[PDB]
């Protein structure tokens, strides 16, 4: 119900309560009600309350940087950050974003994304998030939020909840069972709350026939009471449907205030009328304002000297180091046959594909608003989560500069013409072919793709381009920039394809980061955060075309389905090649963990014991090969078989270690009570089952190097 004394939120509440006492109803209605779609200078705005020096709250997109700004960095999308498996870069990314958001005079950044989590590879906005795994996405959420808010900026965990597809997102009902709702999809929102996230945004879709922004169970019972969330719930943009029920269900903020056309103003004067007509109690509005002002006080935004709103300010500083680092360390090397990579002093190189050069995407062209195009090199998906590039380093330009510097002749075919490609590739030492797939928010249809992807094939005749290049050249490196999984079986069926580089979504540092890896200045060290299957039919979920997604797969999404259904993916979750090898030894498991329901009083995150450490798993990792490289060690836990049906393996830890040849290091996985828990629907509690837990540590969800047990009496 209420945050405890002597904690950041507790002090914010005291402050918030003192402010609330100086306000009248109009003051209060102005704090919770957006001024209207594009009614203010920001993406979202509310009305100031001078009596407590409360500004018009300025809310701006999005998860990867400042939208509409002309002096901001384009950070990598979240999926790329997750792909680094590096908590330091992830936290640094949130911090840098936070610095830019404050420097621009925005109070609330609308991100990061824990929903969609990303159960379907076709999902158009999955790339804004952190991969398909609740644990990793949770850790990322917490690190990104810690980073953002340490600057004194309010973060917004979105989208709550079960917005797993773009098609009919405003009408579809997501209908999973209670365990699935809590244990899979809500999980990462709990990390966000526990990170003291200031705000949560409710989604467009329905949850069991009830619009997410009108849903008392998810908003009040789960988020506020069970997760102990002390901040405010805002709507997604015009995701509000009623005046009264929205308010009474636990909605706190109407965004942006009207629909796109200026209609459907459900709060403002209509909320004033509902309170006056006794349809919404004053205590409810008092609660909304406490939550909103508490977030303001929590982040220190009440102190004099917060920058004024201005998105023309150059706020970039040297933040490109993060984008470079994540674009670089997030590249996943999938295939490296005959050790063709890293490249060394070839006489010639062909570079082939429209995705190698600057196009309308990189240019912020008027043909590509909200990044609604895959034209030229690709840095991110489309929609509200895209931003302007301050610059963009194309793969061709970077490759050309590095290659020319060593007397390597570069030949370019800058289109997707199969015949021009083969011609450029013929006779060259290597040919690097660039393919893409794109997607985004479901209000833009790009090349026939309505938001979600139509299929899992490369865009722009990508498969044919590679086949034509392979017909002309024995040594083909395929570089892929993509919003998600592509089936690569056709490309892999070509014996001429010796290397596959899953470069992900690099933003502005595309070319530099790729050159870093291709030439082996750094070994690639990113690993997959979703499964690349051998067949589109091997995935168990789809973009649903009807009014209902029953979520009948339950807990078994992505790799959990693959493990459960004994399907061999092409490249499994947690998979990544390196230019070196790593040996794992000496697995230990230290545990004090006791069985039963969690027993702590509810605080932000849930019962106070859920995020406390109960165990520690430790392994040694040595670099046994010939070159320096970082390894991503992963922990998977198997629950007792006596426990309610659970996936066979669940990611419960990861560590990243840079090792020079012969160097040895420690990977430590701290285990929180919740990491050994499942959600019990009947008691509405997290429970640790008694029995022997399987402990699996390795280089991927399939590449398990050592095993042990964790026993709970
Ligand atoms: C609705 O949600 C409840 C609780 O989350 C779940 O157990 C139930 O199966 C769902 N009902 C339908 C008809 O999908
Ligand atoms: C906004 O910032 C730009 C760049 O720093 C500056 O030139 C301009 O004066 C600012 N605009 C306002 C209205 O303060
Ligand atoms: O741009 C404001 C909001 O618009 C909505 O359409 C998106 O779903 C949100 O992610 C976004 O924050």
Q: How many CB atoms lie within 10 A of CB 303?
A: 10
Distance in angstroms between the alpha carbons of the first and the last residue of the chain: 32
Phi, psi of 474 (to 5 degrees): -75, -15
Closest to 487 in 3D by CA, of 532, 424, 527, 447: 532
Tokens of 193: 């709350």
Of 161, 162, 176, 182, best ligand 1 pocket probe by most atoms within 8 Å of the beta carbon: 176
Residues 469/433, Cβ–Cβ less than 8 Å: yes
Active site residues: 236
Residue 70 Cα to ligand 1 middle (Å): 46
Q: What is the DSSP string of 254-290?
A: BSSSS-TTS----STHHHHHHHHTTSS-HHHHHHHHH
Is 507 exposed, middle or buried, given 0-12, 13-18 or 19+ CB atoms closer than 10 A? Answer: buried
Closest to 505 in 3D by CA, of 532, 475, 485, 533: 485
Tokens of 379: 């840095």
Round to whole Å and give the CA distance between 94 and 173: 32
Residues 95/612, Cβ–Cβ less than 8 Å: no
Residues 502/331, Cβ–Cβ less than 8 Å: yes
Domains assigned to the chain: 1-304 (3.20.20.300), 316-581 (3.40.50.1700), 582-713 (2.60.40.10)
Which ligand 3 atom is nearest residue 111's CA?
12
**Type and span of the H or E element at 452:** none
Tokens of 184: 């899979």
Which ligand 3 atom is nearest residue 384's CA?
1
Closest to 285 in 3D by CA, of 28, 34, 35, 16: 28
DSSP SS3 for 423:
helix
Residue 102 Cα to ligand 3 middle (Å): 20
Closest to 253 in 3D by CA, of 160, 385, 116: 160
Q: Where are the beta strands (DSSP E) in 404-473?
A: 409-413, 430-437
Round to whole Å and give the CA distance between 530 and 133: 8
Residues 411/427, Cβ–Cβ less than 8 Å: no
Tokens of 259: 């629909």
Q: Is the CB of 384 under 6 A from ligand 3?
A: yes
Residue 697, strand partner residues: 635, 706
Closest to 154 in 3D by CA, of 107, 192, 195, 194: 107
DSSP SS3 for 552:
coil
Is 38 exposed, middle or buried, given 0-12, 13-18 or 19+ CB atoms closer than 10 A? Answer: middle
Q: Would you give the DSSP letter of residue 49? A: B
Q: Is the CB of 674 under 6 A from ligand 3?
A: no
Q: Is the CB of 135 under 6 A from ligand 3?
A: no
Q: What sign does the dihedral 635-114-645-527 (CA atoms) show?
A: negative
Is 618 exposed, middle or buried, given 0-12, 13-18 or 19+ CB atoms closer than 10 A? Answer: middle
Q: Is the CB of 509 under 6 A from ligand 3?
A: no
Between the alpha carbon of residue 482 and those of residues 79, 122, 380, 395, the distances in Å are 10, 11, 8, 14
Of 313, 314, 316, 317, best ligand 2 pocket probe by most atoms within 8 Å of the beta carbon: 313
Q: What sign does the dihedral 260-262-268-271 (CA atoms) show?
A: negative
Between the alpha carbon of residue 131 and those of residues 78, 117, 513, 575, 580, the distances in Å are 8, 7, 21, 13, 25
Round to whole Å and give the CA distance between 614 and 593: 5
Strand ranges of the sheet holding 348-352, from the earlier edge strand across to the other edge: 332-336, 497-502, 476-482, 430-437, 348-352, 409-413
Point out the ligand nearest to the CA of residue 182. 1
Tokens of 222: 């789960």
Residues 680/686, Cβ–Cβ less than 8 Å: yes
Residues 161/189, Cβ–Cβ less than 8 Å: yes
Residue 384 Cα to ligand 3 middle (Å): 5
Residue 315 Cα to ligand 2 middle (Å): 12
Q: Would you give the DSSP letter of residue 643? A: S
Tokens of 488: 């690569």
Q: How many CB atoms lie within 10 A of CB 589?
A: 17
Tokens of 660: 């020079």
Q: Is the CB of 699 under 6 A from ligand 1?
A: no
Q: How many CB atoms lie within 10 A of CB 384?
A: 21
Q: In degrees, to the nearest 5, what angle opens at C-alpha 469 toward C-alphas 463 and 471? A: 105
Between the alpha carbon of residue 383 and those of residues 63, 95, 318, 438, 545, the distances in Å are 11, 23, 26, 11, 21
Residues 504/481, Cβ–Cβ less than 8 Å: yes
Q: Is the CB of 128 under 6 A from ligand 3?
A: no
**Type and span of the H or E element at 316:** none
Between the alpha carbon of residue 245 and those of residues 63, 98, 228, 252, 406, the distances in Å are 29, 34, 21, 12, 68
Pocket of ligand 2 (CB under 6 A): 310, 312-313
What resolution in angstroms, rounded to 1 decimal? 2.1
Determination technique for this entry = X-ray
CA 333 to chain centre: 20
Between the alpha carbon of residue 574 and those of residues 117, 486, 517, 525, 653, the distances in Å are 16, 16, 19, 11, 12
């Amino acid at each position: 119900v209420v945050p405890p004394a002597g904690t950041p939120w507790g002090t914010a509440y005291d402050k918030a309560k003192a402010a609330l006492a100086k306000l009248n109803l109009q003051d209060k209605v102005g704090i919770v009600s957006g001024v209207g779609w594009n009614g203010g200078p920001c993406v979202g705005n509310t009305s100031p309350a001078s009596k407590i020096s409360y500004p018009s709250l300025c809310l701006q997109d999005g998860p990867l940087g400042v939208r509409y700004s002309t002096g901001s960095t384009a950070f990598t999308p979240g999926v790329q950050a997750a792909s680094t498996w590096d908590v330091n870069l992830i936290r640094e990314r949130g911090q840098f974003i936070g610095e830019e958001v404050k420097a621009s005079g925005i109070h609330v950044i609308l991100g990061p994304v824990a929903g969609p989590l990303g159960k379907t590879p076709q999902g158009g906005r999955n790339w804004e998030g952190f991969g398909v795994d609740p644990y990793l996405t949770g850790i990322a959420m917490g690190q990104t939020i810690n980073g953002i808010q340490s600057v004194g900026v309010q973060a917004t965990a979105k989208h709550y909840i079960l917005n797993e597809q773009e098609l009919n997102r405003e009408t579809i009902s997501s209908n999973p069972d209670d365990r699935t709702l809590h244990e899979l999809y809500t999980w990462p929102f709990a990390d966000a709350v526990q990170a003291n996230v200031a705000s949560v945004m409710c989604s467009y879709n329905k949850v069991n026939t009830t619009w997410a922004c009108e849903d008392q169970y998810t908003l009040q019972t789960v988020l506020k009471d069970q997760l102990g969330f002390p901040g405010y719930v805002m709507t997604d943009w015009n995701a509000q449907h009623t005046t009264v029920q929205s308010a009474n269900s636990g909605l706190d903020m109407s965004m942006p205030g009207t629909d796109f056309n200026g209609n459907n103003r459900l709060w403002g004067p209509a909320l004033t009328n509902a309170v006056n007509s006794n349809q919404v109690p004053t205590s409810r509005v008092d609660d909304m304002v406490t939550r909103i002002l508490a977030a303001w006080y929590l982040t220190g935004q009440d102190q004099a000297g917060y920058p004024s709103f201005n998105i023309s300010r150059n706020v970039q500083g040297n933040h490109k180091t993060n984008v470079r680092a994540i674009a670089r360390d997030g590249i996943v090397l999938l295939k490296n046959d005959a050790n063709i990579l890293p490249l060394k002093k070839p006489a010639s190189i062909a570079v082939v594909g429209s995705a190698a050069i600057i196009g309308n995407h990189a240019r912020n062209s008027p043909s590509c608003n909200d990044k609604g195009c895959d034209d030229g090199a690709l840095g991110m998906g489309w929609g509200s989560g895209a931003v302007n590039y301050p610059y963009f380093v194309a793969p061709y330009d970077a490759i050309n500069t590095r290659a020319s510097s060593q007397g390597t002749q570069v030949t370019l075919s800058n289109t997707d013409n199969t015949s021009s490609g083969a011609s450029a590739a013929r006779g060259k030492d290597v040919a690097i072919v660039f393919i893409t797939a794109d997607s985004g928010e479901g209000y833009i249809t790009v090349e026939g793709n309505a938001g979600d992807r139509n299929n899992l094939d490369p865009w722009h005749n990508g498969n044919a381009l590679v086949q034509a290049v392979a017909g002309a050249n024995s040594n083909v490196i395929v570089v892929v920039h993509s919003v998600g999984a592509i089936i690569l079986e056709q490309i892999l069926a070509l014996p001429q394809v010796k290397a596959v580089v899953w470069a992900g979504l690099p933003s502005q540092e595309s070319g530099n980061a790729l050159v870093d890896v291709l030439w082996g200045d750094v070994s690639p060290s990113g690993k997959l955060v979703y499964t690349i299957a051998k067949s589109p039919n091997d995935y168990n979920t789809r973009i649903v075309s009807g009014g209902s997604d029953s979520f009948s797969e339950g807990l078994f999404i992505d790799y959990k389905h693959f493990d459960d259904a004994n399907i061999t993916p092409r490249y499994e979750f947690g998979y990544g090649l390196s230019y070196t090898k790593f040996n794992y030894s000496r697995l230990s498991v230290l545990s004090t963990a006791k069985s039963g329901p969690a027993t702590g009083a509810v605080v932000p995150g849930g019962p106070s014991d859920l995020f406390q450490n109960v165990a520690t798993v430790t392994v040694d990792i040595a670099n046994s090969g010939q070159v320096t490289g970082a390894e991503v060690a992963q922990l998977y836990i198997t629950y007792p078989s006596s426990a309610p049906r659970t996936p066979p393996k669940q990611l419960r830890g990861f560590a990243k270690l840079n090792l020079t040849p012969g160097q040895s290091g420690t990977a430590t996985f701290n285990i929180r009570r919740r990491d050994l828990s499942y959600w019990d629907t009947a008691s509405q509690k997290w429970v640790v089952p008694s029995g022997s837990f399987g402990i699996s540590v390795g280089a991927s969800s399939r590449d398990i190097r050592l095993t042990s047990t964790l026993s709970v009496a």
